Design a protein around this ligand. Structure first.
Ligand SMILES: Nc1ncnc2c1ncn2[C@@H]1O[C@H](COP(=O)(O)OP(=O)(O)OP(=O)(O)O)[C@@H](O)[C@H]1O
Ligand SMILES: Nc1ncnc2c1ncn2[C@@H]1O[C@H](COP(=O)(O)OP(=O)(O)OP(=O)(O)O)[C@@H](O)[C@H]1O
Ligand SMILES: [Mg+2]
Ligand SMILES: [Mg+2]
Ligand SMILES: [Mg+2]
Ligand SMILES: [Mg+2]
Lengths: 142, 142
């Protein structure tokens, strides 16, 4: 039926490069590690992404990922200008640009992380890829 | 390989009742529609769920779902005591207790919703079920 197309999508996950499914660098919404949490709130309000990569000087040097929801732990009274994105930043999980989607889903589940940073052949940033991107190859588009 | 177990999990999704995969009512974290957004912030801080069902008088009368992230649109200056959970509540998607997981994933994708409210045979609430619960039948546990 339509069960059939998902069967083929699973056997083909070991043959799909993560570069074929990622969100490329020029479409990433990211933030500097020295930005305040108030700037993360503003960034969230504009773009509505739950997970934001964090970089030092360029989007080509990701140093981690920040969750917009972690802002909810902080009191507007003083904390938001008083802390930087680095204070809430989780360590990044990098995957090569030619890693297959099958291996990525295995490691995303094991590592208990939802977003991976995809690096290019030369040491910079090619983009990001999330569990939803991997899911949409199996299921369709969400 | 291990590709094999996911093949069986997909053909069996049409034979798995949503009651077999849901989170049951007594383990739901929910909030009253007349609670302030400050109480939703407190509820989020304690339990960390992103989506919370919303009820009138009992958890057996769900009237919608609230997103913790929608609190980030509101200014601590006055809004949080000044609004109620009802002001941010999205309409609920109810599914019967014997609906198959296959049909649920089809409708969750089409409807562009992540959480469904599972109703019991007698008109009350049996629990909730999310796209992740459906995903974990295919993939494992996340
Ligand atoms: N920071 C980001 N910048 C640009 N694109 C992103 C970012 N985060 C995710 N995406 C892309 O948006 C799509 C949706 O991803 P995902 O649902 O994981 O993010 P989200 O909707 O912010 O998270 P969640 O659904 O858990 O709230 C994916 O294709 C992903 O590649
Ligand atoms: N409000 C809730 N109360 C109790 N259990 C819930 C609630 N929301 C989700 N769950 C359960 O927790 C598990 C994780 O679900 P899910 O990842 O969709 O929620 P979440 O982690 O809060 O959302 P997100 O990952 O998008 O931030 C699922 O098994 C789901 O049934
Ligand atoms: Mg998508
Ligand atoms: Mg989404
Ligand atoms: Mg889970
Ligand atoms: Mg989760």
């Amino acid at each position: 039926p339509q069960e059939e197309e998902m069967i083929h999508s699973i056997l083909e996950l070991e043959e799909t490069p993560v570069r074929e499914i990622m969100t490329p660098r020029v479409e990433m919404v990211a933030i500097e590690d020295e930005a305040t949490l108030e700037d993360l709130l503003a960034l969230y309000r504009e773009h509505r992404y739950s997970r934001v990569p964090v970089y030092r000087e360029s989007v080509d040097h990701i140093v981690g990922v920040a969750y917009a929801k972690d802002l909810l732990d902080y009191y507007c009274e003083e904390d938001l200008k008083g802390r930087t994105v680095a204070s809430i930043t989780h360590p990044p999980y990098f995957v090569p640009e030619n890693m297959d989607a099958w291996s990525l889903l295995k490691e995303l589940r094991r590592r208990k992380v939802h977003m991976a940073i995809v690096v290019d052949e030369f040491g910079g940033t090619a983009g990001l890829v999330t569990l939803e991107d991997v899911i949409e190859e199996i299921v369709g588009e969400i």
